[PDB]
Amino acid sequence: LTNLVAEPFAKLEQDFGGSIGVYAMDTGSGATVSYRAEERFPLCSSFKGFLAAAVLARSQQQAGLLDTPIRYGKNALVPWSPISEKYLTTGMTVAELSAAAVQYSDNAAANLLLKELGGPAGLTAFMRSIGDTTFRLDRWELELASAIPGDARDTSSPRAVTESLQKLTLGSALAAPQRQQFVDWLKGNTTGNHRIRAAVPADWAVGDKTGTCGVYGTANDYAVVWPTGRAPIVLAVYTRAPNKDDKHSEAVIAAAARLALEGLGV
Ligand SMILES: CC1(C)S[C@H]([C@H](NC(=O)[C@H](N)c2ccccc2)C(=O)O)N[C@H]1C(=O)O
């Protein structure tokens, strides 16, 4: 199936001027499409989806974790925190911080949740616990977004991202109530309208999480998509480029997603 689209993926990344990694799986048939899917790509803000999943996991053991109010000072605010800066004088709940991290990629919210989890190693440990041996988070916002060529810090692979997303949203990695909360947060994402969501028909349900390091042409998107009356598809699209000033392209991510779905037979 990978062969059907191997040549157009190569042509897409040559027009982009960088590297594109794609993994997609039809949960109905088990068919997969794989292009650079085991290479490492920077996570950028896309780690925040797994962060929310790790918070939900903890909430299974800790009653009421999601409703805990978190107060923070202005020193907790980091650039591009569009939600948490509006509640600085009041605070927010863990559930609100998690939704802000997922749906608005709120940086301060992400750092606040990371600290509750034990930092980047705490999130890495969560991914190890669901069977993901590729994921690694090493730094906090905004330092994790340096996207340096060859640097394995703060990276995963498109295949590992897709397999983990599948376990968390469709498998048994989360208990049923927590699993549906994770899916609903992904479905309410506001930052991905020009990436995987631009690639699917209007009647499909989509939950996604985007990432944008910006430098080194580095950006990404991962998603669970539900074709109407049909089994869900899970996919991840990651990009990078050789030069620090290379620009990222949402259009390229959408185009890669389109090819992956075409390769799956949709
Ligand atoms: C929330 C952010 C605006 S900053 C955060 C971070 N990226 C950066 O710090 C980049 N230097 C940046 C890219 C675009 C706009 C502003 C900053 C990351 O990928 O984790 N992701 C960006 C995003 O996902 O939109």
Tab-separated table of C-alpha atoms and ligand atoms in Angstrom:
chain	number	residue	atom	x	y	z
A	1	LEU	CA	0.000	0.000	0.000
A	2	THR	CA	3.008	2.175	0.763
A	3	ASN	CA	4.227	1.555	-2.802
A	4	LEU	CA	1.086	3.119	-4.313
A	5	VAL	CA	2.012	6.507	-2.831
A	6	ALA	CA	5.785	6.233	-2.295
A	7	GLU	CA	6.502	8.216	-5.461
A	8	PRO	CA	4.008	11.082	-4.830
A	9	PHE	CA	5.244	11.407	-1.227
A	10	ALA	CA	8.797	11.785	-2.535
A	11	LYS	CA	7.549	14.400	-4.989
A	12	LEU	CA	5.659	16.237	-2.244
A	13	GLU	CA	8.667	16.442	0.038
A	14	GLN	CA	10.848	17.554	-2.875
A	15	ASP	CA	8.471	20.465	-3.565
A	16	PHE	CA	8.413	21.213	0.178
A	17	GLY	CA	12.209	21.140	0.334
A	18	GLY	CA	12.432	18.972	3.447
A	19	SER	CA	11.364	15.652	4.899
A	20	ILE	CA	7.834	14.358	5.486
A	21	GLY	CA	7.005	11.412	7.694
A	22	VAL	CA	3.572	9.800	7.514
A	23	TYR	CA	1.914	6.826	9.153
A	24	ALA	CA	-1.748	5.969	8.761
A	25	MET	CA	-3.752	2.930	9.802
A	26	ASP	CA	-7.258	1.854	8.872
A	27	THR	CA	-8.536	0.359	12.122
A	28	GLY	CA	-11.165	-1.577	10.180
A	29	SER	CA	-9.013	-3.423	7.663
A	30	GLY	CA	-5.624	-3.049	9.338
A	31	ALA	CA	-4.108	-1.580	6.173
A	32	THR	CA	-1.260	0.839	6.794
A	33	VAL	CA	0.589	3.479	4.794
A	34	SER	CA	4.166	4.224	5.858
A	35	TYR	CA	6.566	6.911	4.577
A	36	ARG	CA	9.606	7.743	6.726
A	37	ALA	CA	7.320	6.562	9.494
A	38	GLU	CA	10.073	5.297	11.813
A	39	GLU	CA	12.321	8.363	11.456
A	40	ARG	CA	12.436	10.821	14.358
A	41	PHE	CA	10.701	14.195	14.024
A	42	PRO	CA	10.363	16.963	16.629
A	43	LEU	CA	7.120	16.741	18.586
A	44	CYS	CA	6.710	20.515	18.951
A	45	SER	CA	3.387	21.308	20.626
A	46	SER	CA	1.938	17.932	19.594
A	47	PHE	CA	3.214	16.473	22.888
A	48	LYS	CA	0.374	18.377	24.577
A	49	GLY	CA	-2.162	15.814	23.352
A	50	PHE	CA	-0.328	12.982	25.067
A	51	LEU	CA	0.133	15.229	28.110
A	52	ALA	CA	-3.640	15.534	28.468
A	53	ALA	CA	-3.939	11.764	28.104
A	54	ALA	CA	-1.398	11.322	30.911
A	55	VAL	CA	-3.424	13.679	33.110
A	56	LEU	CA	-6.562	11.671	32.351
A	57	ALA	CA	-4.715	8.449	33.193
A	58	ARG	CA	-3.680	9.864	36.574
A	59	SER	CA	-7.261	11.000	37.191
A	60	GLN	CA	-8.270	7.311	37.226
A	61	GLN	CA	-6.291	6.829	40.453
A	62	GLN	CA	-6.733	10.335	41.925
A	63	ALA	CA	-10.385	11.179	42.527
A	64	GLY	CA	-11.283	14.718	41.529
A	65	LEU	CA	-7.924	15.569	39.944
A	66	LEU	CA	-9.657	17.153	36.938
A	67	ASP	CA	-11.606	19.594	39.129
A	68	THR	CA	-8.595	20.751	41.155
A	69	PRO	CA	-8.087	24.521	40.884
A	70	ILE	CA	-4.535	25.552	40.001
A	71	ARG	CA	-3.413	29.061	40.900
A	72	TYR	CA	-0.410	30.505	39.092
A	73	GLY	CA	1.556	33.719	39.168
A	74	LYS	CA	2.489	35.847	36.207
A	75	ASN	CA	5.937	34.233	36.224
A	76	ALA	CA	4.194	31.041	35.043
A	77	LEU	CA	3.034	32.784	31.867
A	78	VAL	CA	5.112	32.066	28.775
A	79	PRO	CA	4.518	33.474	25.281
A	80	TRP	CA	1.483	32.148	23.379
A	81	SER	CA	-0.726	31.255	26.323
A	82	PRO	CA	-4.030	32.587	24.958
A	83	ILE	CA	-6.264	30.920	27.558
A	84	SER	CA	-4.270	30.874	30.781
A	85	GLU	CA	-3.395	34.555	30.503
A	86	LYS	CA	-7.131	35.385	30.709
A	87	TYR	CA	-7.449	33.474	34.014
A	88	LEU	CA	-4.217	34.637	35.654
A	89	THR	CA	-6.090	36.649	38.260
A	90	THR	CA	-8.440	33.740	39.043
A	91	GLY	CA	-6.683	30.450	38.223
A	92	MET	CA	-8.069	27.440	36.326
A	93	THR	CA	-8.881	23.806	36.950
A	94	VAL	CA	-6.681	20.930	35.795
A	95	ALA	CA	-9.372	19.978	33.278
A	96	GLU	CA	-9.449	23.525	31.925
A	97	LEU	CA	-5.661	23.634	31.656
A	98	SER	CA	-5.721	20.296	29.821
A	99	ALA	CA	-8.354	21.486	27.347
A	100	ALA	CA	-6.383	24.716	26.821
A	101	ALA	CA	-3.180	22.762	26.155
A	102	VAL	CA	-4.969	20.502	23.656
A	103	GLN	CA	-7.344	22.931	21.952
A	104	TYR	CA	-5.303	26.133	21.984
A	105	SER	CA	-1.796	24.713	22.487
A	106	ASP	CA	-1.564	26.969	25.563
A	107	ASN	CA	2.098	26.954	26.597
A	108	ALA	CA	1.686	28.029	30.215
A	109	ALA	CA	-1.046	25.424	30.724
A	110	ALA	CA	1.231	22.739	29.308
A	111	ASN	CA	4.096	23.652	31.637
A	112	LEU	CA	1.728	23.717	34.608
A	113	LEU	CA	0.432	20.236	33.768
A	114	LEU	CA	3.968	18.946	33.120
A	115	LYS	CA	4.947	20.033	36.595
A	116	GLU	CA	2.042	18.100	38.112
A	117	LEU	CA	3.186	14.981	36.206
A	118	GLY	CA	6.815	15.160	37.288
A	119	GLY	CA	8.129	17.026	34.258
A	120	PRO	CA	9.232	15.710	30.863
A	121	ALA	CA	10.401	12.417	32.351
A	122	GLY	CA	6.953	11.964	33.906
A	123	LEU	CA	5.251	12.237	30.520
A	124	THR	CA	7.873	9.980	28.917
A	125	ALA	CA	7.188	7.448	31.673
A	126	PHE	CA	3.484	7.553	30.870
A	127	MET	CA	4.153	6.765	27.201
A	128	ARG	CA	6.440	3.937	28.270
A	129	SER	CA	3.579	2.562	30.357
A	130	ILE	CA	1.280	2.231	27.318
A	131	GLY	CA	4.004	0.539	25.272
A	132	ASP	CA	5.581	3.509	23.438
A	133	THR	CA	9.376	3.119	23.466
A	134	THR	CA	10.046	5.830	20.841
A	135	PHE	CA	8.530	8.952	22.431
A	136	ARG	CA	10.837	11.159	24.415
A	137	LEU	CA	10.149	14.514	26.022
A	138	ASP	CA	13.230	16.190	27.456
A	139	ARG	CA	12.526	19.917	27.909
A	140	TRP	CA	9.724	22.371	28.711
A	141	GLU	CA	8.028	25.090	26.687
A	142	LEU	CA	9.438	26.927	24.908
A	143	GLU	CA	12.899	25.355	24.879
A	144	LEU	CA	11.626	22.023	23.570
A	145	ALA	CA	10.776	23.617	20.204
A	146	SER	CA	14.349	24.120	18.928
A	147	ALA	CA	13.932	21.342	16.302
A	148	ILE	CA	17.699	21.082	15.771
A	149	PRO	CA	18.631	18.719	12.875
A	150	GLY	CA	19.755	15.350	14.211
A	151	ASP	CA	18.737	16.147	17.809
A	152	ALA	CA	16.713	13.284	19.310
A	153	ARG	CA	15.455	15.389	22.235
A	154	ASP	CA	11.702	16.050	22.225
A	155	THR	CA	10.990	13.719	19.292
A	156	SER	CA	9.003	10.689	18.293
A	157	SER	CA	8.211	8.883	15.072
A	158	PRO	CA	5.012	9.108	13.006
A	159	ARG	CA	4.411	5.386	13.521
A	160	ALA	CA	4.799	5.558	17.307
A	161	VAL	CA	2.587	8.646	17.521
A	162	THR	CA	-0.126	6.885	15.531
A	163	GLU	CA	0.088	3.635	17.490
A	164	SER	CA	-0.090	5.499	20.824
A	165	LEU	CA	-2.939	7.720	19.691
A	166	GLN	CA	-4.820	4.572	18.668
A	167	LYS	CA	-4.343	2.954	22.088
A	168	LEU	CA	-5.470	6.102	23.904
A	169	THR	CA	-8.507	7.040	21.765
A	170	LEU	CA	-9.736	3.636	20.542
A	171	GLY	CA	-7.910	1.002	22.601
A	172	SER	CA	-7.852	0.216	26.292
A	173	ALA	CA	-5.026	2.495	27.428
A	174	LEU	CA	-7.615	4.726	29.172
A	175	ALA	CA	-10.718	3.774	31.111
A	176	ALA	CA	-13.941	4.396	29.179
A	177	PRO	CA	-14.863	7.791	30.780
A	178	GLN	CA	-11.307	9.115	30.477
A	179	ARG	CA	-11.027	7.818	26.897
A	180	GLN	CA	-14.141	9.720	25.791
A	181	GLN	CA	-12.905	12.902	27.507
A	182	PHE	CA	-9.635	12.616	25.582
A	183	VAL	CA	-11.517	12.187	22.287
A	184	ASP	CA	-13.795	15.139	23.024
A	185	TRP	CA	-10.816	17.397	23.782
A	186	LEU	CA	-9.170	16.373	20.492
A	187	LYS	CA	-12.445	16.945	18.646
A	188	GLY	CA	-12.631	20.491	20.030
A	189	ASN	CA	-9.164	21.488	18.806
A	190	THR	CA	-9.109	24.962	17.234
A	191	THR	CA	-5.605	25.038	15.710
A	192	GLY	CA	-5.809	22.365	13.035
A	193	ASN	CA	-8.330	23.659	10.489
A	194	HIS	CA	-5.682	23.841	7.742
A	195	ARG	CA	-3.919	20.508	8.331
A	196	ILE	CA	-5.465	17.002	8.544
A	197	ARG	CA	-8.940	18.555	8.883
A	198	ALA	CA	-8.521	20.224	5.494
A	199	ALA	CA	-7.940	16.763	3.970
A	200	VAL	CA	-11.126	14.947	5.042
A	201	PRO	CA	-14.762	15.280	3.867
A	202	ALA	CA	-17.052	17.741	5.608
A	203	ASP	CA	-19.187	15.047	7.263
A	204	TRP	CA	-16.279	13.229	8.944
A	205	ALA	CA	-15.622	13.693	12.637
A	206	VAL	CA	-12.023	14.557	13.475
A	207	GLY	CA	-10.030	14.951	16.640
A	208	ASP	CA	-6.488	16.242	16.175
A	209	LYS	CA	-3.516	17.914	17.857
A	210	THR	CA	-1.080	20.147	15.943
A	211	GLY	CA	2.528	21.110	16.558
A	212	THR	CA	4.529	24.031	15.138
A	213	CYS	CA	8.187	24.521	15.993
A	214	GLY	CA	8.313	26.888	13.005
A	215	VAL	CA	12.091	26.843	12.698
A	216	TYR	CA	13.636	24.221	10.395
A	217	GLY	CA	10.310	23.935	8.536
A	218	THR	CA	9.063	21.839	11.426
A	219	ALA	CA	5.339	21.285	12.023
A	220	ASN	CA	2.964	18.382	12.346
A	221	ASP	CA	-0.536	17.101	13.012
A	222	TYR	CA	-1.986	13.826	14.254
A	223	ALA	CA	-5.601	12.770	14.211
A	224	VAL	CA	-8.267	10.154	14.662
A	225	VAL	CA	-10.846	10.512	11.893
A	226	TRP	CA	-14.236	8.814	11.693
A	227	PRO	CA	-15.540	8.248	8.152
A	228	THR	CA	-19.323	8.286	8.287
A	229	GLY	CA	-20.661	4.813	9.065
A	230	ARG	CA	-17.157	3.326	8.875
A	231	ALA	CA	-14.229	2.324	11.089
A	232	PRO	CA	-11.922	5.123	12.278
A	233	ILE	CA	-8.573	5.976	10.716
A	234	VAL	CA	-5.568	7.112	12.782
A	235	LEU	CA	-2.740	9.071	11.181
A	236	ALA	CA	0.241	11.305	11.898
A	237	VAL	CA	2.025	13.740	9.559
A	238	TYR	CA	5.358	15.272	10.615
A	239	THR	CA	7.698	17.598	8.682
A	240	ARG	CA	11.141	19.133	9.043
A	241	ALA	CA	13.605	20.926	6.775
A	242	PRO	CA	17.402	21.437	6.747
A	243	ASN	CA	17.701	25.218	7.218
A	244	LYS	CA	16.696	27.153	10.318
A	245	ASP	CA	14.905	29.737	8.178
A	246	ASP	CA	12.993	27.139	6.167
A	247	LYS	CA	9.295	27.799	6.594
A	248	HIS	CA	6.743	25.175	7.563
A	249	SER	CA	3.708	24.544	5.364
A	250	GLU	CA	0.214	23.648	6.521
A	251	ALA	CA	-0.684	22.926	2.887
A	252	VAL	CA	2.008	20.238	2.758
A	253	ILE	CA	0.606	18.535	5.859
A	254	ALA	CA	-2.901	18.516	4.364
A	255	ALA	CA	-1.538	17.176	1.073
A	256	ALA	CA	0.370	14.409	2.849
A	257	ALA	CA	-2.777	13.479	4.758
A	258	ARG	CA	-4.695	13.343	1.485
A	259	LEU	CA	-2.135	10.948	-0.007
A	260	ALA	CA	-2.216	8.718	3.083
A	261	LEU	CA	-6.009	8.461	2.882
A	262	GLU	CA	-5.800	7.821	-0.865
A	263	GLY	CA	-3.236	5.094	-0.182
A	264	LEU	CA	-5.522	3.488	2.405
A	265	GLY	CA	-8.330	3.272	-0.160
A	266	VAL	CA	-10.662	6.075	0.943
B	1	LIG	C1	1.815	27.528	20.745
B	1	LIG	C2	2.885	27.960	19.747
B	1	LIG	C3	2.489	29.280	19.092
B	1	LIG	S1	4.538	28.118	20.553
B	1	LIG	C4	4.787	26.299	20.639
B	1	LIG	C5	6.247	25.872	20.325
B	1	LIG	N1	6.691	26.571	19.128
B	1	LIG	C6	7.504	27.633	19.215
B	1	LIG	O1	7.931	28.062	20.288
B	1	LIG	C7	7.896	28.299	17.889
B	1	LIG	N2	9.077	29.111	18.128
B	1	LIG	C8	6.735	29.146	17.351
B	1	LIG	C9	6.105	28.767	16.175
B	1	LIG	C10	5.054	29.505	15.655
B	1	LIG	C11	4.623	30.641	16.321
B	1	LIG	C12	5.247	31.026	17.502
B	1	LIG	C13	6.300	30.286	18.022
B	1	LIG	C14	6.153	24.379	20.122
B	1	LIG	O2	6.020	23.899	18.968
B	1	LIG	O3	6.175	23.617	21.117
B	1	LIG	N3	3.790	25.665	19.330
B	1	LIG	C15	3.167	26.773	18.606
B	1	LIG	C16	1.921	26.246	18.083
B	1	LIG	O4	1.715	25.018	18.252
B	1	LIG	O5	1.099	26.991	17.477
